[PDB]
Symmetry: C3
Subunit: 37 residues, 3 copies
């Protein structure tokens, strides 16, 4: 396994961590809307 | 690091991207339900 | 690509699967709250 292909995956995982953070932010916002509804 | 083990991880990341897409679809649906409630 | 660096990524993916499971649990809980509201 070469460095280039491995970095492709590292870049994707980092991207997904960002996607997960955004999803967590959205779900937590929804949770607050329901708690105060 | 061999190709076989690396592909196991590549397959898992691809699977997780699908899981993330589904989660995003669900959260966006919930967001719309709250906006029109 | 060495074993050490590859394991760093394997550990992170495993962590993210846990993060995804928690997000799925939260979104499913929200979905039920809306269905019974």
């Amino acid at each position: 396994v070469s460095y280039e292909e491995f970095q492709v995956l590292v870049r994707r995982v980092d991207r997904m961590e960002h996607s997960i953070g955004s999803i967590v932010s959205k779900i937590d916002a929804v949770i607050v809307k329901l708690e105060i509804m």
